[PDB]
């Protein structure tokens, strides 16, 4: 279980 990315750096 692992969620979708919404922010990056």
């Amino acid at each position, epitope marked *: *279980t*692992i*969620y*979708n*990315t*919404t*922010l*990056k*750096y």
Partner: antibody
């Protein structure tokens, strides 16, 4: 067994300062970014800041940049928050909250999958 | 700019056994990135539903999430006493800031 524990809250005077800590356990601390969310007495929830899994990125809400600085020490399952120039606006209960595992790259999911109970910040004269 | 979330109603008063229907309105599409948390007094807030419709682990089936874009619904079918709490919606489509709804309080009708 996944746990998060906050500490370091107390009472201070306006203009005073504070250092908050959040302690993770039950998981690979460095695998997730950590958030702080606050709840002012009789109010809802407000997001404040997050630090990335690796400790390289940090984001703050408008209201507190310049005042608060977030950091972490993955070697110790630990992050902290230095709060300066405390106002009445800052009074409330502070929760550390885990950013759900973004599969990844240099990511943040924005999902708060585990929250702590909170530590209290009181601002008074 | 930041998505303002609006929750309705502010207080919801029902009886155990009834169906509850809660709404969250975004100011602009959040796509499907909408989460719901349950919050009891002096307890740690808890993740219920993520991505509008996915039940998190441990969360029972009576909790249902639906919606897309700007209008979202949290439904609880056979209300039990422990479902009486405060429910918040949250968005992760456009951040920072992460943004929340003002909360809907679910109270026992008697």
């Amino acid at each position: 067994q996944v746990r998060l524990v906050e500490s370091g809250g107390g009472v201070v005077q306006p203009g005073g300062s504070l250092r908050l800590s959040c302690e993770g356990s039950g998981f690979k601390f460095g695998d997730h970014g950590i958030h702080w969310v606050r709840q002012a007495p009789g109010e809802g929830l407000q997001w404040l800041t997050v630090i990335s899994s690796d400790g390289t990125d940090e984001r703050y809400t408008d209201s507190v940049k310049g005042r608060f600085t977030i950091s972490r020490d993955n070697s110790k399952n630990t992050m902290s928050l230095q709060m300066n120039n405390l106002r009445p606006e800052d009074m409330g209960l502070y929760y550390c909250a885990r950013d759900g595992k973004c599969g990844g790259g240099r990511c943040y999911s924005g999902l708060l999958d585990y929250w702590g109970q909170g530590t209290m910040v009181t601002v008074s004269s | 700019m930041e998505i303002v979330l609006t929750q309705s109603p502010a207080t919801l008063s029902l009886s155990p056994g009834e169906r509850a229907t809660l709404s969250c309105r975004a100011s602009q599409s959040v796509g499907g990135y909408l989460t719901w948390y349950q919050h009891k007094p002096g307890q740690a807030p808890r993740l219920l539903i993520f991505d509008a419709s996915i039940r998190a682990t441990g969360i029972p089936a009576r909790f249902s999430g639906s919606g897309s874009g700007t209008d979202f619904t949290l439904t609880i079918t056979r209300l039990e006493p422990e479902d009486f709490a405060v429910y918040y919606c949250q968005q992760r489509s456009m951040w920072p800031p992460v943004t929340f709804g003002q909360g809907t309080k679910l109270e026992i009708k008697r």
